[PDB]
Amino acid sequence: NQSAIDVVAEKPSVRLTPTMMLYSGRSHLLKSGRYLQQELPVRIAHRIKGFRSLPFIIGCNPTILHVHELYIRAFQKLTDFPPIKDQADEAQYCQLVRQLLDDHKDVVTLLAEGLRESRKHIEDEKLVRYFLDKTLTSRLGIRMLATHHLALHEDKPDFVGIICTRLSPKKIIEKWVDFARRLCEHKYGNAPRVRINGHVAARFPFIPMPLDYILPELLKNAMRATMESHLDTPYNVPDVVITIANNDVDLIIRISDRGGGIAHKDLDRVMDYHFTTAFGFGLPTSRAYAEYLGGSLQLQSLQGIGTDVYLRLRHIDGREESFRI
């Protein structure tokens, strides 16, 4: 809790849209590196401010305290590093960014553990939701900016940093379907087949990074629900049907399962952090990530039949607003 953190804790974020980054990703690495150097300490200070504002009994949890202390250590490193003048200065910063990206890889796990240890002192799940939605999405934003900058140094086909210039939703969904079906097959001996329909030929600019979190979570929920509701017929289960709708405004991905649905008693709890019928972070984090990206995650439960999950995400066309929750 030093005075340097206090100076930028209330300072507004200078937000850049993926379009702005795509135009620079066409001298431009120096302007980009300068932005990160000045903007990342502000984002880290906003996270520290969040920990400072937690109720005392929650902030005292040594696991919560440890994540708070990790963010203070990251602010110290980001500010104590000298400014960027030449290209070798921009390159020295990339190495610090690589190190901080790895030191904070398990923050969400530690935060879930801290939340769990403090369950008896909560009483307001809406306040837990605001803290975690803001912390995890601001963390997503920091990781996206940091990873994009590292990836700008590379000349990877169909990528401008972490922006895929021709992302196919069908291919990204197919990659995670194969990943999910294998885990499900190892647990139940079988997995539902996944059919993909709609705008299967869609290709457009998109950052796959948040879809790499959302898609396995939603597929795992759909497949586990399907298997749990058909234990008496486990080698003859209904397919999971994924429809892609692509238009000028947004991308919609509907994941429809025949997994029995979300019961009426659980319906208002599934979106709370740590609520589970088996981690409990899959749905509320996916919803927060979709909101951060200018979209949404909505559920329609048909109790006794199955669930329809709608993931809506905005395009990158020079019309989109900046990412924020």
Next chain:
Amino acid sequence: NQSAIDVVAEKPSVRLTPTMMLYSGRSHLLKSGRYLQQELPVRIAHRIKGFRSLPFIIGCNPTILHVHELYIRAFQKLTDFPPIKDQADEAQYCQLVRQLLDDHKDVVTLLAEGLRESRKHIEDEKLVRYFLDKTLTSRLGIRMLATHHLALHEDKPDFVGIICTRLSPKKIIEKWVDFARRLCEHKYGNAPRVRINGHVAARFPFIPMPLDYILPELLKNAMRATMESHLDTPYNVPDVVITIANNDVDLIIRISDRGGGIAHKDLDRVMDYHFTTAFGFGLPTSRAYAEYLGGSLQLQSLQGIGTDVYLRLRHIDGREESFRI
């Protein structure tokens, strides 16, 4: 605007649940007839109060004024009729009920016309929504009570008045699919095939009367959208898929079309009364009817693909609350 209307205009409604009516539908016609005689003038007075509360410029529309005057005439008839003592008194009342049911058959049409003539003097569509939602659902309630009482005199198989003791959602949906496909075929030369899945064998107590309004409206929307989006391939159109989910709490009917979806610009207008892309009452009346019955009507639009409409209705099991909006 007489003093007799003033006496009961603020008097709370004495609400009966369909379970209460089903137990009586097992001496019981006199107790039922007594209820209608004392309760219907109160419901009519609540409608008059609604017309009295309309903004002056709207209430002045001679078409709105005419519906207001029709309700005053109905209150006069309901109160000026003598009380029910013997069974022939209960039977004399049935004839007045039959006559009033017919004199008000076109109220919604006149109200739509009055709303249309006053479009330039509205400015608040949320206030139009509250008036019409309340007027049309209270009207639904009056018609349901009046029709149920007439139908109690008959011994119709699987019916206790207007309560079907073993309503099959598949059969009622099939009846209206045949009705809708014929209108659609006469307009476009072809109609989408309707497939029904889910709990196709479900049978339970239910009042079909509101489903007889909601189902043709939703089917017409699904079929018109499908044809309008496939004009270049009109004899090869995608099916409309209806799923039935029945559980202890509610009945869910999902109507999924491949009709291109509800555009982003129209999405917040489709639920307004008189909004249409071709009457404009189908969706907002269906939503109000579903809410009145303890359920809901929700839409999920996949722009460029189609729409999923979810109609949720509560069961009649001795646990349901009374109908109200």
